Every structure is written in C-alpha cells, then in structure tokens.
Design a binder for this molecule. Sequence first.
Ligand code: BCL
Ligand code: BCL
Ligand code: BPH
Ligand code: BPH
Ligand code: SPO
Ligand code: SPO
Ligand code: SPO
Ligand code: SPO
Ligand code: SPO
Ligand code: SPO
Ligand code: FE
Lengths: 44, 44, 42, 44, 44, 245, 304, 54, 54, 54, 44, 39, 281, 63
Amino acid sequence: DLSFTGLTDEQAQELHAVYMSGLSAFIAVAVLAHLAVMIWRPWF
Amino acid sequence: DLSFTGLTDEQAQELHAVYMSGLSAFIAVAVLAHLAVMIWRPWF
Amino acid sequence: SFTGLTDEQAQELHAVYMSGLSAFIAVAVLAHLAVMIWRPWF
Amino acid sequence: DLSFTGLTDEQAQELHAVYMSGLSAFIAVAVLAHLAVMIWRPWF
Amino acid sequence: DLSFTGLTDEQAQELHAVYMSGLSAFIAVAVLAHLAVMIWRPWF
Amino acid sequence: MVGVNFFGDFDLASLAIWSFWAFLAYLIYYLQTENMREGYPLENDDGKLSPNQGPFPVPSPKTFDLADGRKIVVPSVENEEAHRRTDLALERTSVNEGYPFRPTGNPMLDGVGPASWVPRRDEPEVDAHGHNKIQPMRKTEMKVSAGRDPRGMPVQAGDTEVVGKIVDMWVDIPEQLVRYLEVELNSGKKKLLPMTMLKIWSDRVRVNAITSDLFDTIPDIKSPDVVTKLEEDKISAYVAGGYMY
Amino acid sequence: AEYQNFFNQVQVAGAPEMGLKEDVDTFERTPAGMFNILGWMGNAQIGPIYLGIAGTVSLAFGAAWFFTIGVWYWYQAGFDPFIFMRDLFFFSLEPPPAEYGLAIAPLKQGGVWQIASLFMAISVIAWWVRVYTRADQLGMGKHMAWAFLSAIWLWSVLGFWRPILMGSWSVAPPYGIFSHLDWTNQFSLDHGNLFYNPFHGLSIAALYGSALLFAMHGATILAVTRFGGERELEQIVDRGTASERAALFWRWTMGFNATMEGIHRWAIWMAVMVTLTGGIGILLSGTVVDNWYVWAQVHGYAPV
Amino acid sequence: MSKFYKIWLVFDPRRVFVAQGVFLFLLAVLIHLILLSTPAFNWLTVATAKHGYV
Amino acid sequence: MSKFYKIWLVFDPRRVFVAQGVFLFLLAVLIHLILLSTPAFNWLTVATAKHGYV
Amino acid sequence: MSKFYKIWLVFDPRRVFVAQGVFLFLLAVLIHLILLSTPAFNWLTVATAKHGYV
Amino acid sequence: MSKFYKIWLVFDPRRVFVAQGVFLFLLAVLIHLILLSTPAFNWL
Amino acid sequence: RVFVAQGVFLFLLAVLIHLILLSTPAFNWLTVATAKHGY
Amino acid sequence: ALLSFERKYRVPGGTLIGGSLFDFWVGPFYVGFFGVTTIFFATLGFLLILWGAAMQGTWNPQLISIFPPPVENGLNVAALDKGGLWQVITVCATGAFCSWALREVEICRKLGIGFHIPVAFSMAIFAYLTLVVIRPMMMGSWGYAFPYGIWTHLDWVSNTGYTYGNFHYNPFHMLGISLFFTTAWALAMHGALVLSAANPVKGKTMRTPDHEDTYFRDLMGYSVGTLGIHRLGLLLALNAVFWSACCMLVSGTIYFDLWSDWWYWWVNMPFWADMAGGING
Amino acid sequence: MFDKPFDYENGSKFEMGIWIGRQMAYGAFLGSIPFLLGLGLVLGSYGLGLMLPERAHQAPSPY
Ligand code: BCL
Ligand code: BCL
Ligand SMILES: CC[C@H]1c2cc3[nH]c4c(c3C)C(=O)[C@H](C(=O)OC)c4c3nc(cc4[nH]c(cc(n2)[C@@H]1C)c(C(C)=O)c4C)[C@@H](C)[C@@H]3CCC(=O)OC/C=C(\C)CCC[C@H](C)CCC[C@H](C)CCCC(C)C
Ligand SMILES: CC[C@H]1c2cc3[nH]c4c(c3C)C(=O)[C@H](C(=O)OC)c4c3nc(cc4[nH]c(cc(n2)[C@@H]1C)c(C(C)=O)c4C)[C@@H](C)[C@@H]3CCC(=O)OC/C=C(\C)CCC[C@H](C)CCC[C@H](C)CCCC(C)C
Ligand SMILES: COC(C)(C)C/C=C/C(C)=C/C=C/C(C)=C/C=C/C(C)=C/C=C/C=C(C)/C=C/C=C(/C)CC/C=C(/C)CCC=C(C)C
Ligand SMILES: COC(C)(C)C/C=C/C(C)=C/C=C/C(C)=C/C=C/C(C)=C/C=C/C=C(C)/C=C/C=C(/C)CC/C=C(\C)CCC=C(C)C
Ligand SMILES: COC(C)(C)C/C=C/C(C)=C/C=C/C(C)=C/C=C/C(C)=C/C=C/C=C(C)/C=C/C=C(\C)CC/C=C(\C)CCC=C(C)C
Ligand SMILES: COC(C)(C)C/C=C/C(C)=C/C=C/C(C)=C/C=C/C(C)=C/C=C/C=C(C)/C=C/C=C(\C)CC/C=C(\C)CCC=C(C)C
Ligand SMILES: COC(C)(C)C/C=C/C(C)=C/C=C/C(C)=C/C=C/C(C)=C/C=C/C=C(C)/C=C/C=C(\C)CC/C=C(\C)CCC=C(C)C
Ligand SMILES: COC(C)(C)C/C=C/C(C)=C/C=C/C(C)=C/C=C/C(C)=C/C=C/C=C(C)\C=C\C=C(/C)CC/C=C(\C)CCC=C(C)C
Ligand SMILES: [Fe+3]
C-alpha cells in the first residue's frame, strides 16, 4: 500500500479507531451542551 | 501515463475513491444544511 | 518540450483537462440560465 | 504495535493511570469550587 | 523502570516525601496569612 | 475621478488597494520560493525523508556560471551531496523527534555542534583576476597604515597563558582587510587565528575562545602560503566551538 | 568583552584598486587615493570615479538647479550675507500660483521654480541613465536601476504627475528646508489626515520594515563574521557554515528562514515598496480622494 | 469523466489536502461573516427580536 | 465510508493532533467571545439582570 | 474509550505536560480576568459594596 | 494518589524547583498587583 | 573596571541627590540664602 | 522536520535557565524556558485583546482598540474595565519581548555566534518602553501612552505631534527621519548590488566582489565594502531608533512650546536680529 | 554556583530539604530580577518627572 508517513494499514486502522472514539465522545458532549443551551436560551 | 507523484494507476484510483466518498459526505451534509436554512428563512 | 512530457501523455492529459473544462462550462451555463430566468440583466 | 515515543504498552498504561488520578483530583476540586460559586453567586 | 531523569524509584519517593512536607508547611503559612487578611478585611 | 465609483463604494483607491493585496500575496509566494534553494527536501532525525515538506514547493533549478567553467545548480542533488557531512559522531537522546543529539566523542575534534564545519570545496577563494584572495602579507607589498601592528606580540589564551607569538598577517587583497593572524606556537608549529575572534591589546593578542591545550589541535593548512575554503571553515568552526566547549 | 567587529583593529593598505576593465572605457576614470579615517568602519580608498557623458550632464544640471535655488535665496536676502545666514532655512523657492495653471509663469512668480525643476529633472534622468550604463558595462543585472526607478517614481509623482493631474504647478512642493516641511504638513491637513491613506500606511509599514530588516541582516552577518559570512557571493556558490548557522538561527527563532541570496531579494523588495506605495498614495490624494478620514469612515476602518 | 483519478498522478495528496482544508474553512468563515454582517440574516439578531431578549 | 483511516497514511498523527487542538481551542474561544460581545447572549449580563446584581 | 492510554504511545509526556501546564494556567488566568473585568462578578467590588469601606 | 512521586521520574527536580520558585514569586506579584486595582484592598 | 564603575556610580548618585535637594524649595540652599539675606 | 544540514547543530547546551528541562524543539521552533514564557505571555496578550474587543462590541479588526486609563488616574493600577486591561496587556507585551530577546540569546549561545541580533532587538524594546513607560511616567500618568489599535494609535500619534505644533521642527525628530531614510536607501542599494552581482547579464559568468567595488566606485567614487555596508546598515537602524526615542523623551518633559518657535534663537541672536530684510525682517 | 545538583545516594533528608529550599530561593531571585527592574524603571521615571518643571504634568490629554 501507499504510505507517506511510514505507518502500516493495521496501525492506521487501530489509531483511527481510537481517534474515532475520542471524536465521538467530544461530539456527544457538544450535542448535550447545545441541547442545554437551546432549552435555556433558544437561538432559533 | 505520467506520474509526477510516483503513484500507480490503481493507487490513484483507490485514493480517488476514498476522496470522492469524503466529498460526497461533505456535500450531502451541506445540502441538508441548505435545505434546513431554506425552510427556516428562504433567501429567494 | 520543456516539461519532459511526450506527445501521447500530453494528448491524454489534455483530453482529461478538456473533460473537466466542459463540465465546468456546462454548470456555468446552467447557472447563468437560472439567473437570467430569475433576474434578467438584459 | 507502533510507538513513536519508544514507550511500551504497560508503561503507557501506568503513566495513563497516574495521569488520570491527577486529572480526577483536579476535576473534583474544580467541581467543588464551581458548586461553591453557584451557591454564592449563581450565573444561571 | 521508566526514568527520564536518572533517578531511582526510592530516591524519587524520598524526594517526594520531603517536597510534600515542605509544601504542607507552605500551605499552612498561606492559610495563616489568608485568615489574618479575612479577619482584617473579608472579601466574601 | 473624485467620487466616481465603479460599483457601490468601490472607486480607484479601492481597486488600487485590492490590486496591491493580490500583488503582495504573489510577491510573498515568490520570495518564499526563491529562499528554498538550499536545505531541501526536509529530513527527519534519522536522515530519512520527512513525511511533511511544507506548503511551498521547491522551485525549479537555477544555474550559476563560474569564471572557471564550473556550473553550480543550487537546487540539485549534487549541490546537497557535495556539502553533506558524513560519519558524524552524534547520538539521539530520545526516540521522539525534536530532541538534541548528543556528541559521542570530542565535539571540537569531531566538528559537531558549535564546532560544526561544512565540507566546502578544497580550493582557495580567488579574485576576478584568478589570484588567491587571501595571502600572507610577506607575499604582498601591503603595509600597516593604522591601528596596532600585532606582529611580534605574544599570544595569550583564555586560561592566562602564553602559547606563542604572531609572525605574519593574512590579508584579503581585493578588500584590503586583515582576516587571519599567523601564530608560531612554542612547539614551532604555525596556526591561523581568525581576526574576528581575537583582541589586540597594546602588548599582547588575547584569544578567549580557546585555552592553551586546544591551540595545538587547531586545524592546519596544507600549504604554508595558501588557505582553502574548507580549511577556513574548519579553523573557524574549531575556534568558535571553544566558547561552548 | 569579545570583539564585536564594528571597527577594524588594524588597517592595511597597498596600491589602490583601479577597477576591472570589462567593457568600461578606462580613459573616463579619475585617479584614486586613500583616506585612513574611512578605513576604520569601511574602505579607506577614495577610488576612481567614472566621468562619461551621463555623469557630466547630471553634474552640470544638478549644479545648475542648486545654484538657481541659491541665487533665488540671495535675491530674497537682498544681497546681504548676514541676512543670508540668518534666514538660510527660512528661504523658499515657491511654485507658481494656481492662477497660472501649468503655463510658463513670470520669473518672480514661479518661473525660477520651473527653471530649477527642469534642470533637476534633466539631472535625475541623466543619473538614472548613468546607473543603468555603469551596471551594463560591467555585465551586472540592472537591479540598481530598477530600485532607483521606484524613488524616481515617488519623486516625479510629487513634482510632475500629480501637478499635471491637478491642473497647476502650485500643488508641487517648494525648494526650501523649512518650507517643504510646511508643505508636507499642509498636504496632510488639506487631504484630511493622510494617516488614513491606506497606501500611506503601506509605505510607513515598508519603511519600518526596511529598518527592521536591515537591522536583522546586519546583525546576522556581523554575528557570523567569525566564519567569513560577509563574503556573501562565495557563500551563495559555495555554502559554508556561516550561511547554515544564520539560517538555523532564524529558523529556530521564527520557524522560517532565508538563503544568502534570497535575503537580498527580501531587502530590495522591502526597500522598493516604500516609494512604490508612496507614489500611488500621493497620486490618489486630491485626484481620487480628497478627504481620507471620510473615505476611511465609508470603508470601515474609521469610527462613524 | 471516469479518469479524474489521474489528478492524483499530477498533484501530491498532502499539499492538496492541506490547501483544501484551509480553503474550505476560510470560505465557510467568509460566508458566515457575510451573513452576520447582514442584519436580515444575522441569526442572533433575529433570535433577539423573536424572543425579546433585548 | 469505512476507509477514512487511510488519512493516517497521508498525514502524521502528531502534527494533525497538534493542529486540531490549536484549531478547536481558538474556535471555542472565538465563539464564546462572540456570544459575550452580544448583550442578548452574554450569560453574565443575563444573570445580572435576573438576580439584580447591579 | 479504554484505549486512550495509547496517546502516550504517540506524544512525548514531557512536552505534553509542559503544554498542558501552560495552557491550564493561561485559561485560569483568562477566566479570572474576564470575571474581574465584569463589575457584577468582580468579587472585590462585590465585597466593597457588601461591607461598605470604599 | 500515592503514585505522584513518579513525576520526579519525568522532570529533573532541581530545574523544576528553580522554575517553581520563579512561578510562585511571579504569581504572588501578580496577585498583589491585582489587589492594588481596588481601593478597598489597596494597602498602600 | 571596578574603580571606574564605582567612580561613575558615586558621581552620578551625588549629582542626582544634589539635584533632588535643589528642586525642593524647602532644602534649596540657594533659595534659603536668598530668602534669609534678602537677595 | 529538519533541514538537510540541521542535524549536526542540534546539540545540548547554551541554555540560561533550566539546563536540559526545556532544551528541545517543537517543529522548527527551539523552545527553552524563555520560549515557554514567550508563548504564555503572547497567548495571554492576544486573548486579552480579543476580550477587549468583546467588551468594546466590535469584531472589525481595524476598529478594535484598547485604551489606557485616563490621565486623571495617575500611576495607579486602574480597574480592568477602566484601563486596567491595557496595563495587563502592556505587561504581557513587555514580558513577551524580553523573553523573545533572551530566547534569541540562548539560540545564539547554542549556535556559537554573536549577540548582535538580541542587542539590536533590545534597542527596539527600549523604544517601545520609552513610548509606554518612561515618557508617561515622566509626565505623571499612564494616560499619555498610546492605545492598542490599528488606527487609534495613529490618532494618538497625530494628537501627540500636534500638541507641539508641527512636530517636523523637533531636531532629534529630523535626525531620526534622516536616519530612517538613509537606512531605506542603503538597504535598497545593498540588495540591488548583491542581486546584480549574483544575477549578471545573460551569457556572463557570476560577478565577484571586485565587480561590486568597481561598480560603486565608478558610480559615485567610493565603496564601503561588504563588511562596511553591513556595519553601516546596523548602525543606521540603531541610531534611527535611538534618536527617535530621544525626540519623544524630550517632548512634553523639558520642552512644552512649539519646536518651530524653538528654532528662533538663531534668528533672534541680537547681532543680526534687527537687521532689516530677508524673511524674518 | 546557585543551581546545584543533589547527591541523592549518600544524602540525608535534612540536606535534601535545605537543597530544595535553596533551589526554590534561587528561582525566586531569578523571578524577582524582572519585577525589580520594572519597578525601578517605573519609579525612577516617576521620580524624574517629579524633578521636572511644573509644565511636565500639565500636558493636554492625547485622547
Ligand atoms: C513607531 C511610532 C508609533 C507608531 C506609528 C505608526 C504609523 C505612523 C504607522 C504605523 C503602522 C503600523 N504599526 Mg504602529 N507605531 C507605534 C507602535 C507600534 C507597535 C508597538 C508595540 O510598538 C506595533 C506592533 C505597531 C504596529 C503597526 C502595524 C499595524 C502597522 C505596520 C508596521 C510595520 O509593518 O512595521 C514593520 C514590521 C514588519 C514589516 C513586520 C510585521 C509586523 C506586523 C505587520 C505587525 C502586526 C500587528 C497586529 C496588527 C497587532 C499585534 C497584536 C496582535 C495581538 C498579534 N505599532 C508607535 C506608537 N505605526 C502603519 C499602519 O499601516 O497603520 C495602520 C502606519 O501608518
Ligand atoms: C503632518 C505630516 C503627515 C505626513 C505627510 C506625508 C506626505 C505629504 C508624504 C509623506 C511620505 C512618507 N511619509 Mg508621512 N506624514 C506624516 C507622518 C509620518 C510618520 C509618522 C508619524 O511616524 C512616518 C513614519 C511617515 C513616513 C513616510 C514615508 C513612509 C513616506 C515616504 C518617505 C520617503 O521615502 O520620503 C522621501 C523620499 C523621496 C522624496 C524620494 C526621492 C527620490 C529622488 C530621485 C532622490 C532625490 C533627488 C536628488 C538626487 C536630490 C539631491 C541630492 C544631492 C546629493 C544633494 N509619515 C503625517 C501624517 N508623508 C510621502 C509618501 O509617499 O506618502 C504616501 C509623501 O509624499
Ligand atoms: C527605494 C527608495 C529609496 C532610494 C533609492 C535609491 N536612491 C538612489 C538609488 C536607489 C536604489 C540609486 O541608484 C541612486 C544612486 O546613485 O545612489 C548612490 C540614488 C540616489 N538617491 C539620492 C538621494 C536621495 N534618495 C532618497 C530616498 C530614497 N532613495 C529612498 C529611501 C532621498 C530622500 C529621503 O529625500 C534622497 C535625498 C542620491 C544620493 C542618488 C541620486 C543622485 C542623483 O540623482 O544625482 C543627480 C542630481 C544631482 C547631481 C543634484 C545636485 C547635487 C549637488 C547639490 C550639485 C551642486 C553642488 C556642486 C557639485 C558643488 C558645489 C560646491 C561649492 C561651489 C558650493
Ligand atoms: C533596530 C530597531 C528596529 C527593529 C529591530 C529588530 N526587531 C526585531 C529584531 C530586530 C533586530 C528581532 O530579532 C526580532 C525578530 O524576531 O524579528 C524576526 C524583532 C521583531 N520585530 C518585530 C516587529 C516590529 N519591529 C519594529 C521596529 C524595529 N525593529 C526597529 C525599526 C516594528 C515597528 C516600527 O512597528 C514592528 C512591528 C517582530 C516581528 C519581532 C519580535 C517578535 C516578538 O516579540 O514575538 C513575541 C511576541 C509575540 C509573538 C506577540 C506578542 C503580542 C502581545 C502579547 C499582545 C499585543 C501587544 C502589543 C503592544 C499590541 C500592539 C497593537 C498595535 C496596533 C500598536
Ligand atoms: C488572574 O488570576 C488569578 C491570579 C486571580 C487566579 C489564578 C490563579 C492560580 C492559577 C494560582 C496557583 C496555581 C498554582 C498551580 C499554585 C501552586 C501550586 C503549588 C504546586 C505550590 C508549591 C508550593 C511548594 C512549595 C513552597 C515548596 C515547598 C517545599 C519547600 C522548602 C521545600 C521542601 C523541604 C521541606 C524541607 C521540609 C520542611 C517542612 C516541614 C513540615 C518540616
Ligand atoms: C462573495 O463571494 C462568494 C463567497 C459568494 C463566492 C462563492 C464562492 C465559491 C468560489 C465556493 C466554492 C467553490 C468550491 C470550489 C467549493 C469546494 C468544492 C470542494 C472542492 C469541496 C471538497 C470537499 C472535499 C472534502 C471533505 C474532502 C473529502 C476528503 C475527505 C477525508 C478526505 C478523504 C481522502 C483521502 C483520505 C486519502 C486516503 C486514501 C488513501 C489511498 C491513502
Ligand atoms: C464566522 O464563522 C463562525 C465561527 C460563526 C462559524 C464557522 C464555523 C466552523 C467552520 C466550525 C468547525 C468546522 C469544524 C470542521 C470543527 C471541528 C470539527 C472536529 C473535526 C472536531 C474533532 C474533534 C476530535 C476530537 C476529540 C478527537 C481528539 C481525538 C482523541 C482523544 C482520540 C485520541 C487518538 C489517538 C489517541 C491515539 C492512538 C494511538 C495508538 C498507538 C493506536
Ligand atoms: C470587471 O470585469 C469583469 C470581471 C466584469 C469581466 C472580466 C472578465 C474575465 C476576464 C473572465 C474570464 C477570463 C477567463 C479567461 C475565464 C476562464 C476561462 C477558463 C480558461 C476556465 C477553465 C476552467 C478549467 C476547468 C474546470 C478545468 C479544471 C480542469 C480539471 C478537472 C481537469 C483535471 C486535469 C487532469 C486531471 C488530470 C489528467 C492526468 C493524466 C495523466 C491524463
Ligand atoms: C469564557 O469562556 C472561555 C472562552 C474561557 C471558554 C474556553 C474554554 C476551554 C477551551 C476550556 C478547557 C478546554 C480544556 C481542554 C480543559 C482541560 C481539560 C483537561 C484535559 C485538564 C487536565 C487537567 C490534567 C490534570 C491535573 C493532570 C495533571 C496530571 C498530573 C499530576 C499526573 C501526571 C504525573 C505523572 C503521570 C506520572 C507519569 C510518570 C510515570 C513514570 C508513570
Ligand atoms: C552661496 O550659496 C550658493 C549661492 C553658492 C548656493 C547655495 C544654495 C542652496 C542654499 C541650495 C538649496 C537649498 C535647498 C533648500 C534645496 C532643495 C532642498 C529640496 C528640499 C528640494 C526638493 C525638491 C522636492 C521635491 C518633490 C521636488 C521634486 C521635483 C520634481 C519632479 C521636479 C519637477 C520637474 C519639472 C517639473 C517641470 C518641467 C515643466 C516645465 C514647464 C519646465
Ligand atoms: Fe547582505
């Protein structure tokens, strides 16, 4: 496979899985915060 | 059949496939946002 | 040839470039038709 | 099995455990301070 | 045996114990100063 | 054209300022690309090609024509290879990037860190006439016209010791500038001391960069009357490395 | 306590260098000499100067312009040498009044100013030709001529192009020490706080940047004079440790660096920019914008 | 055309991706700022009018 | 699509993570300051009006 | 996720700790200065009004 | 927790002690300067 | 180096303190003299 | 990433504080203790400027302005909403500039070069401190310093200059203006000369320094030299900044009237003051 | 001479505490250098202004 960074395919898959878990947690927290703000002070 | 980057034809095809999937996701999200804005506050 | 390309590579590259140009021009024509229908400037 | 820093898996786990203990202490103190301020001067 | 400083584990433990004793003394002095200020001029 | 707008509030001044913004963007791009003719492509700590090379591409090669028929293509593999040091006595201090490299042996003798030298071409720098640019004053008709003449003065090192005496000066003939002092050590060997890293007192020449023990290992010139660019680089690197080492 | 290489510790001198021949007529070169006072910071040689045609024309007409201003000052002093010294900085050779427009004015009412201006223009054009031809005969790249052209552009905008566009010579600055400062201040006052001219701000940015960049470059070169860093051309063709250390200093400091050759491109463009933008800013004043503060208010960088 | 993938035979992916990300962010910021500078489409101002916040 | 992991074959995670952290911090600070600059959505101002602090 | 510890396989802990300390101190100082810039939440001015010595 | 001593396996204590002294002194100076802003707590 | 620096420091300090006293009308000895002697 | 020649120079040592605690690089940037302090101060100043923009109520980058406390405040520490934010930003800027200079000193020590660059930067730091600290305190109030805004500090410059009539007549000011003009002229000449030697007429070989000396001797009869021109440029810039600082130091502290009126002692010297004729009668 | 290493092996607790105190005191002195320089600059400028004529403190506000 093509790899500019030197990583392999499986290393990239594992790193992306961890990164996606972190991103999912971040997005969930952001969604909860936006729901709270919308309930407290809607902007639409 | 030139290659300034050094990639092969199949590597370019795989890269384009992933890139087009990402672009399709981005464009779909943008279309949904535009539809929501048009419903909320049309500009035409 | 200052670029190092050959005749056939140049022809294929130009063919793909012309395909992209044709797509862009077609989209521009459709956009201008829509604008002219909505708000003519002539 | 990539390791940019040269640490092993168990070393990373131990470092993360201690780091999470420190973060937990910091967050607990921050929560107590926020509750005290909320009682003293609510901002919501 | 992960060490970036050339310190053994027991040396680190003893140094931390001494450092924490001094830190507690410093906290006590700061608490005394804060109580003196609070008696002289409360800020709450 | 006062108050004459092409559209809205856009007048000649607005056109001029926006055109200047576009021209300045292009000029910044051009200036940055012109300054990437040396040191590229980027490498990692292991000397391998860096995955990230920056947003600015390396420009197309340019050629310098020398007076002796030699051609230099500054952004080329040959130029980078000719100026690349080999067998460096260095060791990584960490697996991570961005950490310093530790000298394995004697940094001043190995020529690393502040004592690093670049393998310049092993020929003397010449003037427009082809004569050597830097020659000892005994080979010229120049004379001291001002300042203090250091010839015959003792040389004192940074440890307050006398290591020798000045015997001759080396002068940039086209520029009429003294660049090196030649010192005869107490062991009879002759060395070259850069003018920019010494002080001339009323009675002595003081060199604080290095101590007495280091004067004996100063790099040497192959010929007693000619100094090459590589020798200049080595001597300057050795003397300047004494401040840290 | 170390040697900072601001002044030479010892001076040496032989026969003066008379210059490379190339395609230059050596008959036009004067003799040369030495001046030891100039050898402490630079070269002690007052070398030969090329005479030629362009230099002769420039010298004659520049001296004519200088002497025209001087004799006007003597007339304003009423032949009194003591009044001449007492009011030397207050004398002024003013342009013709706005009534005469662009036509030739009477001597007492701007004709002397027009004569001096024509002499000055001839001298400046001749000197530009001299710069270009001295570059050409030695086989050099004409960069000095193009750099001079930007200053000429600002100078001609101040005195020729803007007066033509405004319809009168009266808007040109006068020939005087204090009087042209008053002209500068009055120009700013008349065109509504020239501070708010965007090209004026660009010119000021370029001037500050020229000072900053020359400070940076001079300090960098003097810092690497231990390794012969001032021999810039040889470093360009044969890179030494001086260039590498300078580049690494600036890369470690601000994340990006230059080369021994491209730093001079930065320098020349930064220095050209002040006059290049200043000419545009002056040309826009009065012809396109007459109140820069109101223009700034309209375009969103002044309060309303 | 099915041969657009050949653009990756001409352009290096890394610089293209970096430039595309920067360009998309700047374009989105520009459009959002244009909307915000127009009171008719400033969603904060419209919300303030709709809910009587100020 | 489930082949986005190949982005780590193009960009090194360390640089991407640093850039992402900087971007997210600056964006969050900017949005918070934009809300604070608007009295309708300045939560400190709303709390002051609600609780009569001034 | 239970695999977040692998971040220490990507980033050197020393530089991470330095950056985290600088960032947290900067953030705390910024929030305190923002609160002090608001008279309603300036606790020194609040204490001054409450006890009444100046 | 009891495993915080391992911080001395990461950062060399002497340099850390110097940096901590700098930080603590500057923090005290900053707090005093902040207190000078309000007249009620201006001790001068 | 030490002697020259000390001399400069002492001279500048003395000049500064004398100027401080002079600018104070209460301690200005010339002002005191002209007030007392009716100059 | 590293330049192709960078590896042999990244060696330990040269730090002023902390030893090897901060002796590492982040990308191309060397960090050090003073780099840590620089990043802290710079980020704090930038975020406080943004917060002051939030308080002002404008997000136009050309309209944001943080003003110092009013003149009536004296030297007191002002409230954050009444000029104290300006003081905090000023402290952050001073800390960042000094930390930058000390980081440059550390980088110089690591590379084994001189300290001309940090000394020259300290000159500009002195000018900045003159405008924000020395002169306002000699005038008795923080309110005389300039504000932090792209055009409001230009308004401050205009008002300060017109406090004394036409500021062109300040003599140190004239000297500084002449030095700045000379610096720009010399920079143009140096860049052009080096580029013309490096990029000769097509078909010609690269020119030597002898060509540069010959060119400038032919044009004007004198050549200062490469070392000479670098020394001269550095000294010109430093003197320009120093004399500008002096011109601002003497204005409003020991001189309060019009400088154009100052220039009249030469005219009013009694041996020719009453001589009729000329401009001044 | 001020920032010195500690001999952890063959080192007593009292000496360790004294060494930590000395290191922190040296850090405090280093951090006091800029504070003292800034305080001196401000106060010296204010004193010089106090020694200036009366018109120095009566300039019109530039705002
Ligand atoms: C020197 C005497 C006066 C003064 C008189 C003027 C005048 C007169 C003019 C300027 C102009 C400018 N001044 Mg001012 N200026 C002063 C003090 C300062 C200080 C300072 C902390 O000392 C700074 C940072 C600035 C900054 C600036 C820039 C916005 C602009 C172009 C300068 C330039 O290119 O310089 C050379 C430096 C470089 C080329 C390098 C790059 C520097 C960049 C451009 C600085 C950007 C600063 C940014 C807007 C704000 C910084 C804080 C942020 C939080 C990062 N001024 C004092 C009070 N200044 C001009 C302008 O256009 O104003 C609108 C102008 O006409
Ligand atoms: C109250 C006065 C106004 C003002 C009014 C003007 C006006 C009006 C002008 C400038 C101009 C300039 N101003 Mg302004 N300016 C003000 C405040 C400032 C401040 C500040 C407050 O700090 C600064 C830094 C500046 C800075 C500057 C420069 C950036 C700019 C061009 C300079 C230059 O190269 O000039 C001098 C250089 C030349 C004239 C080029 C000369 C070229 C010729 C070919 C050479 C000489 C001829 C011949 C050889 C001579 C004889 C030599 C013999 C050897 C004897 N201004 C205020 C707001 N300023 C100019 C500009 O471009 O503005 C946009 C301009 O015309
Ligand atoms: C990038 C813009 C900057 C710049 C650039 C620049 N100027 C340049 C150049 C460049 C690149 C040149 O190539 C050119 C040059 O040759 O420089 C050495 C020049 C030059 N810039 C000059 C001046 C100059 N540049 C200025 C500005 C700047 N020039 C900008 C900052 C200024 C300002 C700030 O006002 C001045 C005054 C000249 C030194 C030179 C152009 C020389 C020239 O044009 O000569 C023809 C003019 C005359 C001969 C006039 C008369 C001179 C004497 C007064 C004659 C009378 C006296 C008589 C000879 C003796 C009398 C003795 C007794 C009897 C009294
Ligand atoms: C000989 C004196 C000249 C000079 C010299 C000089 N300046 C230098 C150097 C040198 C030799 C450097 O080594 C150094 C450098 O690294 O350059 C690349 C520097 C430098 N000169 C700079 C700018 C600069 N120099 C100027 C002037 C000059 N510098 C003089 C003419 C000017 C002018 C006239 O306006 C400017 C803008 C920087 C690019 C750089 C120093 C960078 C630095 O300090 O970085 C650390 C700080 C930050 C990244 C940001 C801090 C932000 C603050 C915390 C908040 C903002 C506060 C500020 C007061 C707001 C101002 C608002 C304005 C609208 C007023
Ligand atoms: C604008 O924002 C404001 C300022 C309003 C609020 C911002 C505030 C912050 C963020 C404040 C502080 C953050 C921190 C992190 C403060 C400090 C925390 C620490 C970690 C303080 C460390 C104190 C440690 C001290 C003095 C060292 C004590 C060690 C002393 C000598 C050496 C140990 C030797 C000891 C021998 C034995 C002696 C003791 C006994 C009991 C015998
Ligand atoms: C005032 O003027 C206005 C603003 C009104 C004018 C309006 C103007 C314009 C000019 C608007 C836009 C023009 C464009 C050109 C908009 C953008 C079009 C594009 C080109 C959008 C691109 C979307 C691309 C996206 C998200 C990226 C998808 C790629 C995603 C991850 C990357 C996946 C590809 C990969 C990862 C590499 C992995 C594969 C291998 C084999 C390693
Ligand atoms: C003016 O315009 C305004 C401001 C009004 C509106 C314009 C707005 C925009 C354009 C806002 C934002 C656009 C974006 C694109 C914002 C960012 C969205 C993202 C992409 C957020 C990413 C969050 C990612 C997060 C938390 C993940 C960080 C990842 C982690 C913890 C996972 C750690 C990963 C890996 C640890 C270690 C694996 C190691 C091994 C050895 C397997
Ligand atoms: C104020 O004045 C106004 C503005 C009112 C009027 C002024 C107006 C003007 C000056 C308007 C326009 C002038 C022009 C010249 C507009 C543009 C004409 C063009 C030339 C448009 C070209 C669009 C080109 C497009 C889409 C093509 C992009 C090409 C591609 C996708 C093809 C990709 C190529 C190659 C992929 C890969 C093939 C590789 C192999 C190995 C076969
Ligand atoms: C006005 O509203 C604004 C604008 C301010 C909104 C802006 C807001 C933001 C951006 C708020 C915060 C975002 C964040 C990212 C806050 C912080 C999150 C974190 C991640 C805080 C982390 C605190 C971490 C703490 C205490 C841990 C320090 C760790 C330690 C003591 C333990 C490490 C020592 C160790 C591990 C042993 C390792 C060595 C061995 C040999 C095992
Ligand atoms: C004893 O003393 C003697 C008599 C020997 C000589 C003493 C002499 C003095 C005192 C000479 C000069 C004193 C001054 C003060 C000279 C000038 C200083 C300045 C500041 C000259 C500034 C000229 C400034 C500017 C913008 C002029 C630019 C000039 C131009 C473009 C020239 C315009 C050219 C041509 C207008 C108009 C041609 C059109 C016609 C109809 C001829
Ligand atoms: Fe140069």
